[PDB]
């Protein structure tokens with residue numbers, strides 16, 4: 001993590017960069033987690049034009065430790081290589097002792113305000129619709145577990161949360177939501193057997209938020225596939241719809257803002273689902289049926305219910321890992337996702353959508 005060592009590695013692992021020396025290379029650490037240290041590494045532009053280096057930037061990733069990973073760290077690299085092969089993720093460039101080097105994407109992540117732009121929403125639906133056709137249009141590795149990660153994420157993170165003895169003010173009754181977790185997984189096992197396109201099991205990103213969508217040339221691209229895996233495709237869309245209400249760009253405590261009124265509008269949700277199905281169904285994109293759309297939208301809201309529990313548990317675990325480094329209040333965030341669960345459960349009950357859920 002010493003900058004000159006980073007320069008030395010890049011000069012010998014990026015093609016034609018060895019024509020430079022360490023004084024031609026710039027290293028800028030970008031925001032990292034506990035599992036990663038990320039650096040923007042570049043050749044100074046005037047040095048680049050003189051030597052005519054065409055790959056001026058790379059992304060330099062130093063691996064953390066597996067035990068701190070809340071995703072699955074043992075299969076993350078194999079999954080990323082597959083995504084890189086089919087040009088879905090940023091291109092893997094090289095590996096080194098303790099990390100890897102990836103293509104640098106020029107542009108900016110989408111903002112919370114970009115998700116109000118209807119043209120941006122259409123672009124996102126096209127990208128995700130085409131992306132979700134991967135498992136049926138190409139042959140993904142046959143040994144990959146096809147269990148929907150809604151089960152795996154919920155099970156894995158509920159276990160880690162129940163192993164805590166503190167749990168003071170995240171909720172006074174954590175086992176209420178631990179028992180709610182069991183209710184959702186049992187309901188979703190029945191609910192997803194109903195014939196619904198939204199219940200199709202495809203390879204999913206599973207962390208669809210605006211800052212994981214890059215806007216490069218007006219071509220939207222996905223990044224950060226660490227949580228990716230097989231899942232109900234409605235879960236990927238439900239995550240994106242939820243994220244229209246959460247702003248992570250706020251730069252003071254608690255470093256997030258929730259605006260439930262900003263939830264993607266119904267006409268926007270229609271426009272998204274129609275656009276999505278136009279790309280996800282190929283030989284007959286005849287899914288302009290409103291009853292198919294209205295049922296697509298209902299399955300999305302059902303999956304949204306469980307995502308609030310999934311990410312609340314994730315946030316509880318992150319809160320016990322961190323300790324005033326970014327000062328993002330993971331415990332307040334978890335409490336807000338738990339509140340989102342209660343409000344979503346009430347709404348679904350009020351419309352009789354989660355029958356036999358046993359409140």
Ligand SMILES: [Mg+2]
Pocket residue numbers: 211212223224
């Ligand atoms: Mg990210």
